[PDB]
Design a protein around this ligand. Structure first.
Ligand code: A1AWU
Length: 203
């Protein structure tokens, strides 16, 4: 059970993600086998077309743009002042062939609605494709966090240790439309087992 301090710490994590703006993405740009037309029957949730959003610049709602999402696998999200460390890490890993890295589409997961986005007026959940990352990718991410200070991912209880879920976000859908969500997941599940090639860092 969550204690008084643990519940208060969860309020801090939510508010920290709401106030967090102007951050950099340390991810791996990838090529996906699915296309926009594959989800033609699906209705998507785009905050740029919605009303009641309290802070369009907050990272908790800013990137909820329907299926208009760049194909990429996020390794970590850190602050803007760490951009020199991230540039230094990309030069330290200059001899690493990122194109040899590869992921495997395992399962389609609809992430729960984050409380940070819901408080900002968002009504969308992320439908992603969970990936199986190799040891090379896991080691690249761990050394990345060793060179570049990165905030700890706290998506659940503050007491639980973070479990990295490597994924490619396919699109956001409304949280109050189960038929549209189930149909999207069923169509996305047809791409399970597809091998995903990395092209390089996200720019
Ligand atoms: N439940 C749950 N959710 C998880 C988990 N892991 C990740 N998520 C994601 O958590 C979110 C919850 O708050 C959301 O539910 C869900 O959405 P995404 O995975 O699509 O992430 C948003 C994208 O925008 C960031 N981003 C993009 N572009 C930039 C940029 N230019 N600068 C800085 N940041 C950028 C992210 O890095 C991108 O992925 C998890 O384990 N469990």
């Amino acid at each position: 059970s969550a204690t008084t301090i643990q519940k208060e710490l969860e309020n801090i994590v939510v508010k920290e993600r709401q106030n967090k703006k102007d951050t950099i993405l340390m991810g791996l740009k990838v090529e996906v086998p699915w296309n926009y037309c594959d989800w033609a029957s699906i209705s998507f949730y785009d905050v740029r077309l919605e009303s009641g959003i309290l802070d369009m610049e907050s990272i908790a709602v800013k990137y909820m743009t329907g299926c208009d999402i760049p194909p990429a696998v996020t390794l970590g999200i850190t602050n803007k002042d760490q951009e020199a460390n991230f540039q230094r890490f990309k030069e330290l890993t200059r001899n690493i062939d990122l194109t040899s890295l590869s992921f495997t589409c395992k399962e389609v997961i609809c992430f729960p609605q984050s409380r940070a986005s819901k408080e900002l007026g968002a009504n969308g959940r992320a439908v992603v494709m969970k990936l199986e990352a190799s040891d090379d990718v896991k080691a690249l991410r761990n050394v990345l966090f060793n060179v570049v200070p990165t905030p700890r991912d706290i998506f659940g209880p503050v007491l639980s240790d973070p479990v990295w879920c490597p994924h490619v976000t396919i699109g956001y859908v409304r949280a109050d439309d189960e038929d549209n969500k189930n149909s999207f997941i069923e169509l996305a599940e047809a791409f399970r087992g597809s091998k995903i090639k990395v092209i390089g860092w996200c720019e």
